[PDB]
Write a protein that binds this ligand. Sequence first.
Ligand SMILES: Nc1ncnc2c1ncn2[C@@H]1O[C@H](COP(=O)(O)OP(=O)(O)O)[C@@H](O)[C@H]1O
Ligand SMILES: [Mg+2]
Ligand SMILES: [Mg+2]
Lengths: 19, 357
Amino acid sequence: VEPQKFAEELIHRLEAVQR
Amino acid sequence: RTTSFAMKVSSKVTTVVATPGQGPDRPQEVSYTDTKVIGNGSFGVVYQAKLCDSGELVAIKKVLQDKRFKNRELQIMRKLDHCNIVRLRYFFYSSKKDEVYLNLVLDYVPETVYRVARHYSRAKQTLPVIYVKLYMYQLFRSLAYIHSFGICHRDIKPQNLLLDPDTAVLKLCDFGSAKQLVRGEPNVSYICSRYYRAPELIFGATDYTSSIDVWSAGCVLAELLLGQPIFPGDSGVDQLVEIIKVLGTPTREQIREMNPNYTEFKFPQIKAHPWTKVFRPRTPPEAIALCSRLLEYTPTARLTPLEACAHSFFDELRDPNVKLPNGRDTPALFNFTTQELSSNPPLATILIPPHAR
Ligand SMILES: Nc1ncnc2c1ncn2[C@@H]1O[C@H](COP(=O)(O)OP(=O)(O)O)[C@@H](O)[C@H]1O
Ligand SMILES: [Mg+2]
Ligand SMILES: [Mg+2]
């Protein structure tokens, strides 16, 4: 998949498991 | 998932002219009976049969030969001869219509690492470390062998690790995804099964190496110690989250090693989870140590299969007074060839104890 779209999803997820 | 883009009835006795696995093409009549379905993957249907002559049980993998993809499975297996790889006895072809099926006649092996691990998970027990040592050691030997040829399995998982519980022998199988990785030629990203995919693969790297197999093996090791997969999840993001939730957020340098196309994204910084807190408190320190040296973000940082065999976690297997719980003696562990030790010959000092000469 597109790196931009992939990174967004991961960043969104990592923000939830951190805070 | 998938790879890259481009009988005579005579009991009911089946007779085919099958070509042997080793040596030059010298086909011979092979007769067999008692055929029944025993296992299946995502591609092939596996039958059990009894060879009419020897009476020996065999497994016949019947795969549809599609010309829309690259089928190196037969090509690769025929060049492999190792005690921790399932032997290809014979192969032949058979025919809705206008379809060609490849038939791989293999040694029958009764169990898989998956099925065995599932037993202990159901029983709420953990597989004894001796078996963990045994299984993993034989796995790394098989990887050392195929990597010496430049071949990468690309689908290392417990369902592909056949076991003979009586002799405690592990044999690698399923080369339907295997490939000889050439430094310079790109490969398919969506390779390997879920839970065991290397982080670089998840990031979509096409220039990966055989070290993905080492990562997969680390996942298997971890799974044996845990009693469940360490990095579950349906999607690539889900799996990567799990990985990060253990290894911590990969540094920019580590990301560059996996896939340089992600170096400029601001990923939230998650603190790594200590390996000793990951596993049970009764988990052997050297097992934990071995896992951390396998499950590294940077592919080149991971141990080689040969190095992994030399790890001190497998020191119990080099003990001359080690035996199997059922009473039997340990399998072949020190019969390394020059080919297996090609990546690092001086490791033979460790790999081969003085009582094995
Ligand atoms: N030689 C064998 N002996 C006994 N069972 C086997 C043998 N080979 C494969 N199997 C079983 O059949 C299953 C599918 O075989 P596999 O080669 O992995 O097919 P696929 O490529 O479609 O996954 C395996 O998970 C394994 O349990
Ligand atoms: Mg399989
Ligand atoms: Mg397969």
